[PDB]
Amino acid sequence: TFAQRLNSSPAFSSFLLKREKAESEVPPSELELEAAQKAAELEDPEVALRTL
Amino acid sequence: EEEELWLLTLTQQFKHIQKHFGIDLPHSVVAHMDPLLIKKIDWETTNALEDFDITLDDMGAEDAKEQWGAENLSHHFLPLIRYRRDLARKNGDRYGPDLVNG
Amino acid sequence: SSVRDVKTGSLPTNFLTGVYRFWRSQNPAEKPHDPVNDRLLPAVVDASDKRASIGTWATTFFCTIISCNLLGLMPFNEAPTSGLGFATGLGVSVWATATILGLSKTGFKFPFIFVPLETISYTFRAVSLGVRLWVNMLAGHTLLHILTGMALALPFSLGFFSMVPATFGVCCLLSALVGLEYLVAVLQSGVFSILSTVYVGEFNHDKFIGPAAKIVK
Amino acid sequence: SYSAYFAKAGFQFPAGLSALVAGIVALNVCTGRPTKGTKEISNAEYNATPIGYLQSPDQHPTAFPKVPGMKDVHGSPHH
Amino acid sequence: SYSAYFAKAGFQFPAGLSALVAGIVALNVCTGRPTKGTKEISNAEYNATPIGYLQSPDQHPTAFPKVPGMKDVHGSPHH
Amino acid sequence: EGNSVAGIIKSVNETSGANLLSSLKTIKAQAAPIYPAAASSTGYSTQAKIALFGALSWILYRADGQSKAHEWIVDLNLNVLQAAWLISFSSLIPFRAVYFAFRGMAPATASTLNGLKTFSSISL
Amino acid sequence: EGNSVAGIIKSVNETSGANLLSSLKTIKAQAAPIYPAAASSTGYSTQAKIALFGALSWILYRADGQSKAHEWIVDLNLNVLQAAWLISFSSLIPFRAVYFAFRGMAPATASTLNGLKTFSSISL
Amino acid sequence: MKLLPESLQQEAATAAVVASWVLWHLDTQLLPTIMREHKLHACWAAAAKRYNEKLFKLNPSY
Amino acid sequence: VLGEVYLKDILRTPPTGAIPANVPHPFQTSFYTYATKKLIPRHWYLLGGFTFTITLYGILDGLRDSGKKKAYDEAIHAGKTPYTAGGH
Amino acid sequence: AVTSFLGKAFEKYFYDFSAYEQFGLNRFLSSKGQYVALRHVGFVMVGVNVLLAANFPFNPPFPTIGMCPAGWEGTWVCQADKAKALEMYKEWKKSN
Amino acid sequence: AVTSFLGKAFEKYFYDFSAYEQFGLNRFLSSKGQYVALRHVGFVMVGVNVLLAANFPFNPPFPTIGMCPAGWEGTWVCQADKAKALEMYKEWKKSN
Amino acid sequence: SQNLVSTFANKVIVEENLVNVAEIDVPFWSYWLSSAGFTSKDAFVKFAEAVKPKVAALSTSDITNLTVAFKRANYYDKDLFTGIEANVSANFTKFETEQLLQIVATFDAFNHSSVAFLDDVADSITYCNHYLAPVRAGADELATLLTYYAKNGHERADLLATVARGFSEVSLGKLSAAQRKDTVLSALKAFQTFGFYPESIEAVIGAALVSPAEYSAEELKEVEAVKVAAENALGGEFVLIQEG
């Protein structure tokens, strides 16, 4: 998700943001969360072929 | 399979920018993936027009602002229209959008 | 020859983007009469060429003063703008920048008994822009020096850890004064660059070279 | 992610900071005047004078003075 | 051959040359004495004195003298 | 370095019909963008060593000059008043909120990147 | 990075008997030691720029001090007497012979490297 | 207290050197970086209606 | 087909071997390009505004130094000392 | 190593080691925001008293408001003019 | 570019451009080794005469052996004591 | 020493050894010598053969410097300009409009055109460069590029829309009154050749009709031939604006 990608960014490995999470400021939507789950299934391209 | 490489390069490039832009995308990878966009953006800073989109916002020029963004990404269609111009040249034709009344 | 790589969306890039766009917002471009299209695009670029870089100059003067003002609040450090020639040297430099911009429009010629009085109000902007920066960095630090001396007289005379509540109340007023000097350090950098957009923006006017010929209807 | 790529480059100074500290030092060393509490003298006077008489008390204040105005050297006693 | 590998690295200083020029400069700036033709004076004397009287003629020799011993400044005329 | 989509087209076309579906994760990884791995830890950069020694040399130079001042004990206690606010700013400032407030200052980070859509670039 | 002899043994063993002799130049090149190619020309290093500007700053500082000297014209003509020998040393010194004379000063370059012989390490 | 410096020209030229370095560093190092990051977002947001329409008309996929 | 020569230096995919060097702006490459295209055309008002302040404060330094020389020669001619004392 | 430990050490001190929770100051203090206001003035009051205790026998350059530190009240520490206090300190220094 | 040309330029001057062959000094001179001995003293004699011609009206700090440059013979250029020569030069300078 | 300097002057400082130093960087040296007025055909033959194995690896600044240099020297080497046009065609994305307008004006001075060169230059100005780069160009340079495409008959309507942006009251006002006449009369012939009448042709026609005393009777006939042709294409009537 976008908040998961900010948590892996170099800004949150810095000292004043080590104990912060990007979900705490703006939480991901359920449409954002279900699309992050839907994208994880399609990262296997064989599964994306059999789905399509 | 005729023009699949250009259409999937645009998809591959924009999906990598949109995944990483504003988060961890380096400026070197942006200038690698789109060298002509960085060339056009660097022209504005060189010619003292670094605030030109702010200038178009000041005068309410929404159609010129849409023309500004489209002309700065106009090289995305250049691999296609150099291909379609060479296709019409091998078949003896003239290219359609290259002509004034065509 | 090898420039460094930058992360997109870095906090100093986002801070300097909002800062530059704020001082560019102070002198906005005028909306022309005609709709902006390819006919009016060279007249928009030429009107941008005749405009001074007040957006660039004010964020130059904002960043160079808020960095100098906050040096006065760092330990083992004093503010460069607490010196007279530094802070007033920036204010005469802005006033001379606005005057040279105004003089380059007409002829580089300097423009009954009314205009000597309006000249004094104009050339006082040379003094007052830098002196307001200098006195604010000086009088706040001078008041901090006097009150730290009066706060030091209590534990010197009345024992070090002997009696707390009198030296607690003066160390609270001293701590609120350094926090006030933090607010003045940011505000006086803002007031300087707001006034620099006002003073230089007076002469930031040229006539729009619109279309001399038109095919109407 | 690109996070481990940006941790590879260490601390770096701003790009022209050497030209800033060159201009600031050159404004403080190329003053064209004697250096703040000293006076240029003749070569005959400099060679004849001991080091203790060549120093002045005002230019050597005490590092942590027990009385305000203590000086580290006493200078020349010849007035 | 390895010739094109050794042309990749440019000129480099010797490995601890910064510590050599740090030690040589610190022996010339931390002398603990006034600087070669100057004398430390009081703060009262330094503030009252003009720059031309604060300079001495011996410390300003002429860059290409037509007569041996020409000085650039005349100093204080008060003896 | 050739582009990765033409490598996908070349690797998918060259593969057999039998081992197409098994080799799709191999073609996926060959066109994956390079993300450089975490290198070995190095303590201090050269310019980081100059910056910390230069700030330490500047602090010792300014503390030596403050101690030789006329109001010398007022100068050293003004360093206590100034360093106390640096401690209080580490306690009071919402460093996650200030990060996202600065992120909303630039329009490039205040919104998500709106550009090319999927249906416009579908290749059939 | 694995060693190149085990890559030779692995590539020769894996090849067919039919295409062994044709693929021997490919296995030869895969085990060839890397010799980095001539990179793009860059005019001056950063430390080369400090060295040339620092020598120019030192020359101008010493020429300014020599000109303000008492025997100032003798000092500037001593620079002519000294720079004339630097020109004559470029003319007289046999720079190839001095290179091979210095090469014979170190025993590592005065002789060829005598070590492992062929018959002792023959592998049959 | 310190009111007038030892040289007024030295303090003004120090302010001139610091402000011209910040003017140089902004125009050369910060604003080219800012505008590469701003106008990539800004050109994409200003074109995306006309870019996706032009790309829709071009491909024969539908 | 469209065959990768049509998008050679125009469109590139995200890199797979190594992250390249950053492309410099012309102002980062040379100071002479910045001086002739932006610094002198756009910012010569500041540079002349700085030049005004350095020359004006050098005039005020000359008036301050002539006031010290006038007060110095007035005390020498009057048989006085020009400076009062050191505190030591 | 020397830098990687010091980063791990101060991270534990900045975040994990809190003296507000280990000393149980929720009984005495209302908020954590008012603890850091008292820790602020508490840092100032310590740094005032430590800088004075690091060298107590000194004549103050700051004006004392007619008050004397300890049982001195006539010594060089309490003298108003500093030219007299320098001469009185030299007699006190050779004895002590 | 600026450095790569200057290396190619001086390489042509150091090796390829020889004034010993282009001027045909084999007729006048015996060896190339005696040409570089004459080019050595020829470099010294030029640099002596150029440094004197760069500023000729000067009083010499080196001792002239009772000799005068041109038709001066009584001016500040020929004066023995330099304190007198400085006063004579100031009268000559305001006229010229 | 009156003749030792003169003997050194006739053999060492000659134009032939000025060339022998100039062989290292021909695009640099031919550009700055011809800027100083050294336009000599015998030296520029030696310039053309020295740079010919190096043209394919030249940068865009070196190609532009070399092309402008051989324009000022007025020397045409067709094998040199074939490799120059092969460098522009191979690297057209890297070239700038400010550089290409100087390359086209050299290719228009002596008639040298390729159909691949005309396509790659038009693709570079329209798509590889900023769309407001003709605004910074100067109308005398844009009219030369318009004439170069009209004489070769190369109809590129996407290029013609980009180049016509540069013509305005700003860019034509910066020209001399004699130079504005040759710019207006050559841009109006190129716009009438392709039948392309953009909205910015009002500035080119209006630059002729606000000062018609410079123009002849037959020139005002072919100006108002384009004016009525642009009135049909843009669908209106031509009117001169007066400020107020």
Ligand SMILES: CCCCCCCCCCCCCCCCCC(=O)O[C@@H](COC(=O)CCCCCCCCCCCCCCC)COP(=O)(O)OCCN
């Ligand atoms: C604002 C709210 C309050 C916040 C807290 C209070 C603020 C003050 C707190 C003080 C901390 C400041 C930052 C801490 C820096 C030291 C710790 C550190 O992280 O060290 C890193 C570097 O720290 C520094 O070196 C910064 C020091 C800056 C001081 C500048 C002084 C200048 C003196 C030298 C000038 C010479 C110029 C030469 C020009 C060529 C290590 O660098 P690296 O190589 O391992 O790679 C990591 C890079 N991301």
Ligand SMILES: CCCCCCCCCCCCCCCCCC(=O)O[C@@H](COC(=O)CCCCCCCCCCCCCCC)COP(=O)(O)OCCN
């Ligand atoms: C008169 C006598 C004075 C004697 C006093 C000592 C002064 C000696 C002078 C020479 C000292 C060294 C000069 C430094 C300038 C050249 C270095 C340089 O070009 O800058 C950088 C080289 O890279 C560049 O950025 C080149 C760009 C030019 C630098 C600055 C340009 C001029 C800025 C001044 C403001 C101009 C605007 C106003 C002009 C009137 C390197 O800087 P850095 O170490 O801080 O960055 C490396 C960190 N990784």
Ligand SMILES: CCCCCCCCCCCCCCCCCC(=O)O[C@@H](COC(=O)CCCCCCCCCCCCCCC)COP(=O)(O)OCCN
């Ligand atoms: C219309 C456009 C003009 C463009 C020019 C821009 C000028 C302003 C830009 C900022 C640069 C300022 C540096 C110039 C300082 C000039 C000061 C001066 O002329 O007086 C000096 C003259 O002093 C000397 O004779 C010694 C030589 C000093 C040379 C100064 C070198 C410092 C230059 C700074 C580097 C600038 C670049 C660094 C990054 C911006 C010293 O001043 P003083 O009051 O202490 O002494 C006066 C005599 N008693």
Ligand SMILES: CCCCCCCCCCCCCCCCCC(=O)O[C@@H](COC(=O)CCCCCCCCCCCCCCC)COP(=O)(O)OCCN
């Ligand atoms: C002995 C017989 C007679 C022989 C001829 C006479 C000898 C004198 C002739 C003078 C020539 C000396 C060498 C020429 C050096 C300049 C030409 C050159 O080759 O430049 C190269 C570098 O030249 C130099 O920079 C050397 C300059 C040395 C002078 C040292 C002065 C020191 C001043 C700065 C000290 C600051 C210390 C800072 C510490 C961190 C370019 O370097 P690069 O990056 O392109 O890579 C090539 C490396 N192989």
Ligand SMILES: CCCCCCCCCCCCCCCCCC(=O)O[C@@H](COC(=O)CCCCCCCCCCCCCCC)COP(=O)(O)OCCN
């Ligand atoms: C008392 C006040 C003095 C003030 C005067 C200014 C002095 C300031 C002091 C700090 C200035 C910088 C100190 C430099 C030393 C640290 C740098 C260093 O460690 O050296 C090199 C870092 O790499 C090393 O070699 C580390 C090895 C240590 C350096 C020297 C060791 C000591 C040598 C002294 C002799 C010791 C034997 C006798 C001891 C009694 C870098 O040198 P480079 O730039 O010339 O080489 C880079 C070229 N590519």
Ligand SMILES: CCCCCCCCCCCCCCCCCC(=O)O[C@@H](COC(=O)CCCCCCCCCCCCCCC)COP(=O)(O)OCCN
């Ligand atoms: C049995 C083994 C002992 C090991 C120690 C080895 C010592 C020798 C190795 C070489 C290092 C020499 C540096 C020490 C210099 C000491 C000079 C000194 O003590 O007097 C200074 C005392 O002056 C001062 O008070 C100011 C402080 C000066 C500090 C000197 C710093 C320079 C240190 C050099 C760096 C060494 C490392 C660099 C690379 C080798 C200055 O001398 P002066 O005659 O000019 O003035 C005397 C007073 N009027």
Ligand SMILES: CCCCCCCCCCCCCCCCCC(=O)O[C@@H](COC(=O)CCCCCCCCCCCCCCC)COP(=O)(O)OCCN
């Ligand atoms: C209660 C008992 C105490 C136990 C003692 C041990 C506990 C530690 C106590 C405090 C130690 C402070 C050491 C901090 C400096 C060293 C940390 C460091 O620099 O390491 C990293 C962490 O950097 C920082 O810590 C920077 C954090 C600064 C933020 C500001 C925090 C609050 C500052 C308050 C202002 C204080 C002002 C002065 C007050 C007296 C960066 O380097 P790295 O190589 O490991 O990173 C990898 C990249 N190469």
Ligand SMILES: CCCCCCCCCCCCO[C@@H]1O[C@H](CO)[C@@H](O[C@H]2O[C@H](CO)[C@@H](O)[C@H](O)[C@H]2O)[C@H](O)[C@H]1O
């Ligand atoms: C004494 C007066 C002066 C005080 C000091 C002045 C300080 C100057 C720096 C403050 C500038 C910050 O100003 C910042 O401008 C940027 C321009 O990108 C705005 O940026 C943002 O605006 C809006 C609303 O927030 C968003 O929808 C938008 O996407 C984004 O551009 C921020 O809303 C504003 O916070």
Ligand SMILES: CCCCCCCCCCCCO[C@@H]1O[C@H](CO)[C@@H](O[C@H]2O[C@H](CO)[C@@H](O)[C@H](O)[C@H]2O)[C@H](O)[C@H]1O
């Ligand atoms: C929570 C509420 C947040 C409100 C945020 C918006 C207010 C931010 C305050 C920052 C300062 C406002 O900045 C304000 O800018 C305007 C224009 O924009 C300036 O206005 C100036 O514009 C030009 C400049 O020459 C002149 O023509 C005009 O007469 C003058 O007023 C003001 O002098 C300045 O005060």
Ligand SMILES: CCCCCCCCCCCCO[C@@H]1O[C@H](CO)[C@@H](O[C@H]2O[C@H](CO)[C@@H](O)[C@H](O)[C@H]2O)[C@H](O)[C@H]1O
């Ligand atoms: C150097 C020391 C510090 C000195 C700094 C002085 C300048 C400070 C600039 C920041 C102040 C402006 O504060 C600015 O407020 C505006 C609203 O007005 C916010 O603008 C936006 O924030 C977020 C966007 O993510 C949303 O809640 C909303 O769309 C809007 O409020 C900016 O994100 C914030 O940055």
Ligand SMILES: CCCCCCCCCCCCO[C@@H]1O[C@H](CO)[C@@H](O[C@H]2O[C@H](CO)[C@@H](O)[C@H](O)[C@H]2O)[C@H](O)[C@H]1O
């Ligand atoms: C810094 C300025 C220069 C100062 C240098 C002063 C030191 C000079 C050292 C070199 C002098 C010694 O000169 C040295 O002569 C011996 C013989 O004696 C040579 O020794 C050998 O040379 C070669 C080997 O290749 C053969 O001819 C032979 O085997 C032997 O003569 C060295 O190769 C040469 O280097």
Ligand SMILES: CCCCCCCCCCCCO[C@@H]1O[C@H](CO)[C@@H](O[C@H]2O[C@H](CO)[C@@H](O)[C@H](O)[C@H]2O)[C@H](O)[C@H]1O
């Ligand atoms: C005033 C008296 C002192 C004058 C100055 C002294 C200068 C000192 C430097 C000169 C040293 C050179 O000395 C050098 O020693 C090396 C040791 O490796 C010898 O090195 C060589 O010796 C012999 C014969 O040449 C070779 O067979 C052998 O392989 C090799 O080691 C050189 O023959 C000699 O030239």
Ligand SMILES: CCCCCCCCCCCCO[C@@H]1O[C@H](CO)[C@@H](O[C@H]2O[C@H](CO)[C@@H](O)[C@H](O)[C@H]2O)[C@H](O)[C@H]1O
């Ligand atoms: C001793 C006095 C000290 C105080 C000095 C302050 C005076 C400063 C003014 C300097 C004037 C000369 O400076 C010169 O001005 C002319 C016009 O005159 C400018 O000329 C032109 O510049 C650019 C074109 O590139 C345009 O943006 C500008 O509108 C135009 O006027 C020059 O680019 C500048 O270099």
Ligand SMILES: CCCCCCCCCCCCO[C@@H]1O[C@H](CO)[C@@H](O[C@H]2O[C@H](CO)[C@@H](O)[C@H](O)[C@H]2O)[C@H](O)[C@H]1O
């Ligand atoms: C706006 C803030 C400043 C407020 C003060 C404004 C008044 C300052 C101007 C005072 C004018 C009198 O200044 C008059 O001008 C000349 C310049 O020709 C000064 O001359 C000055 O320059 C010359 C050479 O450049 C030097 O001798 C010296 O630096 C200084 O004396 C004279 O000392 C004085 O005769």
Ligand SMILES: [Zn+2]
């Ligand atoms: Zn203070």
Ligand SMILES: [Zn+2]
């Ligand atoms: Zn000597």
